[PDB]
Amino acid sequence: EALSGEYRSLVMNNPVADRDDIWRNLLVDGKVSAEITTTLLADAIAGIQ
């Protein structure tokens, strides 16, 4: 959560952005819980999809 806030504040230069805009812009979901495990190829696949 903290990294995402600072990411869209510094990199995306749009602090008011939603956190899902990080998902759409970076092709990774950050709001997952710490138990959701996936492989690494599978995450690349879900991102490109």
35 binds other proteins (CB under 8 A): yes
The CB-based long-range contact list for 25-34 (8 Å cut-off, 24+ gap) reads 30/1, 30/3, 30/4
Whole-number Cα distances in Å, 27 to 13, 32, 37, 44: 18, 13, 16, 9
Which of 2, 3, 36, 40: binder of other proteins (CB under 8 A)? Answer: 36
Task: Quote the least distance from Cβ 35 to other proteins, whole Å.
Answer: 4
Nearer to other proteins, 11 or 46 (CB): 46
Contact residues for other proteins, defined by CB under 8 A: 33, 35-36
